[PDB]
Scaffold this active site. Structure first.
Site, PDB file in Angstrom:
ATOM      1  N   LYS A   1       0.778  -1.214   0.000  1.00  0.00           N
ATOM      2  CA  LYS A   1       0.000   0.000   0.000  1.00  0.00           C
ATOM      3  C   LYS A   1       0.819   1.277   0.000  1.00  0.00           C
ATOM      4  O   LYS A   1       1.946   1.317   0.465  1.00  0.00           O
ATOM      5  CB  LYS A   1      -0.903   0.055   1.219  1.00  0.00           C
TER       6      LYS A   1
ATOM      7  N   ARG B   1     -10.581 -11.523   1.328  1.00  0.00           N
ATOM      8  CA  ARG B   1     -11.214 -12.540   0.472  1.00  0.00           C
ATOM      9  C   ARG B   1     -10.744 -13.916   0.913  1.00  0.00           C
ATOM     10  O   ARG B   1     -11.515 -14.835   1.158  1.00  0.00           O
ATOM     11  CB  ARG B   1     -10.807 -12.395  -1.037  1.00  0.00           C
TER      12      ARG B   1
HETATM   13 ZN    ZN Z   1      -7.950  -5.628   3.931  1.00  0.00          ZN
HETATM   14 ZN    ZN Z   2      -5.772  -5.668   1.514  1.00  0.00          ZN
END
Ligand code: ZN
Ligand code: ZN
Ligand code: ZN
Ligand code: ZN
Ligand code: ZN
Ligand code: ZN
EC number: 3.4.11.1
Lengths: 481, 4, 322, 481, 4, 4
Positions: free
Chosen positions: D259, D333
């Site tokens: 990120k 997920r």
């Molecule tokens: Zn996450």
């Molecule tokens: Zn993530």
């Protein structure tokens, strides 16, 4: 009928009121002192408390915390701290009266009527004109008859700033080159008939061989204007003037070196150099200072088009030097090259230019003080001392040859309008302007970090701050005395 | 306003 | 004295690690005078010293942290209060989890330039055998990404009990210096001078022409500035105003946030963070990031790490001792 | 001694007080009504006014604007509007008492004691624990003896939410997998001894063949935990349970698909799926609802390292399907693939999972309502109706095969953990989870747009919002009746 | 949290 | 070194 803003200091035995506050307490037979005690913890500086129905005439009374009575010049902060305490406290008090939808307020002089009037007229301003959804316009007057010309000196200084904030805040499609010159023109003539305005058109600018300024204005269909203001305040008309110069880009999109979309709306305030210096001439003339002052401001938009400036182009300044325009978003430099050569025509005592010039000044000091680059420590000292007083701080930045160098090595031309590096972004742009200045008393004030207020200056709401118009007015006052 |  | 600093800085970080740096300074200080003492304090000491903010930065790497402590006993009376110097010693700044872009991150091998500069000046003060007492303090660690590095949002406790929210892992100098600056008050100093390749914003500012000095002492400002005229290795003052403290004091989880909400005044906000860890009346923070490197600007320096401003610092001590 | 929050509605002849307010006015012999009149314009909804020394016991009295008395379900907004009026108004009133540094307040029930208690306990919360600089802890109690169990139902519902806000707001270095399981564990046992906690270690997760969850946890040195909670509320122990599942990433750095630095600190709240559902089980047990509920939460961090998940890796879920992990920042997920197969073990009536899953849900609805993907319009309807009541709104999103498709075409594997496109980012991630769900009553609530509050929900200060924990508690209450 |  |  109305509201009343009242001050109080931090503890002695009982925290003490301003003599106006003590008087009012006696008048309601100790009821203010009593309700203050019942309301709990004491008011620290900047904070507020409102008391209802203490007096038939003031059904809302706001008591504002003024901090220490004897707070003076702070060596660490470089300002009068009391003046700053008072600006924030009566600004907060006045906005509490406005939220009560009360149209009039009497403001406590707080031992310094000038700083009390600056907090109220600066703290209550918004720029409301285009919203149909507006706040009650409150009318702020002095609570008393004793110190009147100090309170009105505050109203003067703060209205000089609020002109600048309105010139800056107005959307660029309304505040175009012609519009800006026309509002300043009227504001200068109402201040004194010892004035002359010249809203010089494109044909004059062309005749004046200001090719660097013209190169920037060509990409837009909005006409350029070279504004020239004179305030003849000296007894002898032949006294050499003080000249002010200001960047007047009414919108900076960057042109072909186009800007990113995010928050480019704040570029409507890229004429904040011309707003600031022009507001101070309007206020010098209102103050009817015994000096001669010329105001110079190149006004154009910087747009992309089929005829805009292209990166790499070489344009000739009034003084014969060629500039390689490597980046079209360094247009202030260009506009100012020509306006600064023109300032030497007037045979000045001082040349002061201001400009929302670089984002790098914002990364630097950006926000806390405007950067001033000067070849004159005398002039540095003058602006700095005025800054202590107004509280609208100024900070010096280097005008070293090292930076000239990065702007002087240039492929096609005499000067390049941007340096090879990101480093010292505001010092390189200052070095570019010095190339167009032979005068011994020159200051460049880069105003880009102080263009906007959010929360930092307590007595200013969110939006264009009009900084540093009051440090500039104070400088002229002291210079005239 | 250039950026940096 | 300057070329030592340039060599400490220029050496690839895999050779100039925390232990290596302390060991070269140690030998350079003892050859300068036997009126010296070196303490290459290990992780266990730093832990015992409750320097959790510095430890938080060093944990992401497998390279061991070192807290270097140098003493030059130059005064006739051993009980004279010292002048203390503090310096950032990140031997490589990759940013950690708030990871840096690849382009030119090799220059981050010189992010121990705060520790190089002040340590070279102590070595030169001792060589000059200046009649003063000086302590040199330098937290040395690398700032790497890993399965145990500092995470954005973490709250760590400084030696002084304040909590720091580590919102950005690439503002690690601040952290290392929080702890080393509280420790400097232990020595009962006359002056506290820290140096650091702290922010890229100082580089955008003055960056290149002069190192920025933030000081609560105009006496100290004046001293460094006058030494700067002499050495030619210029110094320029920057604001240590409460306005900037504010942007670092409003903080969600903690007492101080290690980065400001805005891009604006990047070097003044980081200076405001350090002041939170300093009660001393004569403190200067010299942000050396714009003067880390030379290309062509200083004629008598070739291309590479400049070791600036080590001579202005030595001159300051000379004049201070006379 | 203390403060008092009092309500008033918008005009009739005179705007009318709550009967508590009318009573208090009679008690101070009309002085409240009188000072309200003197203070100026009427209080519109959410707004506040403070009156000092009206009564010896309540030296500060805050009157809060409650809007229209008869405001009910709004068809456009899908909530009870009165309940929302009251939450915002007594939250604002309570924070005014706290700024007066008053430690106790009596709160007007405002015709709905439950909504009055929710505004005060939600509106006064901060997460103060690590700052040494804190606000006065005020103690909010009901002003009266009449409607007590409704006020305490509000205290219950709001404390269930504030647990979630504290689980979320705590820096990830303190709120690790083990720490989170241990605080929920204690909070569930204090709520009822009809509970069992299993803080299942890595060896269990390994034995359970939860390779997709294990693949995410490996990059960190912080140990994974699979939290399993049981509340045995039914008379018959053999009643099939309602199961809740929640994403418990204690920090999401993205891992190798790392990120950007900007604001990645908010990723400490990527266990907000596990916080929300676990707080609601704690509150169901406190409410001692006559139902059986299992709480399932995979807890790990997602870090970059020399052993993290690599883009392209194929991992096997508990159910035998292979997942290509094309992007390491789609880890929710993965964690949820395994926890959702495990939920079928319990033989559930309903499977509800929650998760701060995609930034695309934030771009979508993001902020105004949490998105719920369900194969059961019965279940949709249940959550939606509970949402009207709590005011913590829910909005349906498509669980169409079209999206399954973009996640089913996959090079190496059975399912790819990210779609080929940016389009319908929250619907593709919902399609991935359905691949691991055979149950007929399943809802996936993507909580990423409601993770945070700034100003939008009036009765919540800035920070982690703990949404939608009360809609979830309301759903269980109604489901149990 | 992935972005979009 | 952070950037800006
Ligand atoms: Zn996450
Ligand atoms: Zn993530
Ligand atoms: Zn520009
Ligand atoms: Zn511009
Ligand atoms: Zn860094
Ligand atoms: Zn660094």
């Amino acid at each position: 009928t109305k509201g009343l803003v009242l001050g109080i200091y931090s503890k002695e035995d009982e925290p003490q009121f301003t003599s106006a506050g003590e008087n009012f307490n006696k008048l309601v037979s100790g009821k203010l002192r009593e309700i203050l005690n019942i309301s709990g913890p004491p008011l620290k500086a900047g904070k507020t408390r409102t008391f209802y129905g203490l007096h038939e005439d003031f059904p809302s009374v706001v008591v504002v915390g003024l901090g220490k009575k004897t707070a003076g010049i702070d060596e660490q902060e470089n300002w009068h701290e009391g003046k700053e305490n008072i600006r924030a406290a009566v600004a907060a008090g006045c906005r509490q009266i406005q939220d009560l939808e009360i149209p009039s307020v009497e403001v406590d002089p707080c031992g310094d009527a000038q700083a009390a009037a600056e907090g109220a007229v600066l703290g209550l301003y918004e720029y409301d004109d285009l919203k149909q959804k507006r706040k009650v316009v409150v009318s702020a007057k002095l609570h008393g008859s004793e110190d009147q010309e100090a309170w009105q000196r505050g109203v003067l200084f703060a209205s000089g700033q609020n002109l600048a904030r309105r010139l800056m805040e107005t959307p660029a499609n309304e505040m175009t080159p012609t519009k800006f010159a026309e509002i300043v023109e009227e504001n200068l003539k109402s201040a004194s008939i010892k004035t002359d305005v010249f809203i010089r058109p494109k044909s004059w600018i062309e005749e004046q061989e200001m090719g660097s300024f013209l190169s920037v204005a060509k990409g837009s269909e909005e006409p350029p204007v070279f504004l020239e203001i004179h305030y003849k305040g000296s007894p002898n008309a032949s006294e050499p003037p003080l000249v002010f110069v200001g960047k007047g880009i009414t919108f900076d999109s960057g042109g072909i070196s186009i800007k990113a979309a995010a928050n480019m709306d704040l570029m409507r305030a890229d004429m904040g150099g011309a707003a600031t210096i022009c507001s101070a001439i309007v206020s010098a003339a209102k103050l009817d200072l015994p000096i001669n002052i010329v105001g110079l401001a190149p006004l154009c938009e910087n747009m992309p088009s089929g005829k805009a400036n292209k990166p790499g182009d070489v344009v000739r300044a009034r003084n014969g030097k060629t500039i390689q325009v490597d980046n079209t978003d360094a247009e202030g430099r260009l506009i100012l090259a020509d306006a600064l050569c023109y300032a030497h025509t007037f045979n000045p005592k001082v040349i002061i230019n201001a400009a929302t010039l670089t984002g790098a000044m914002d990364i630097a000091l950006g926000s806390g003080a405007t950067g001033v680059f000067t070849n004159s420590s005398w002039l540095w000292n003058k602006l700095f001392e005025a800054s202590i007083e107004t509280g609208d701080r100024v900070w010096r930045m280097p005008l070293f040859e090292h930076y000239t160098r990065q702007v002087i090595d240039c492929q096609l031309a005499d000067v390049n309008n941007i340096g090879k590096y990101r480093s010292a972004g505001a010092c390189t742009a200052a070095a570019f302007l010095k190339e167009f200045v032979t005068h011994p008393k020159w200051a460049h004030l880069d105003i880009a970090g102080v263009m906007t207020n959010k929360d930092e200056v307590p007595y200013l709401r969110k939006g264009m701050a009009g900084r540093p118009t009051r440090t500039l007015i104070e400088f002229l006052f002291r210079f005239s005395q | 306003x250039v950026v940096d």
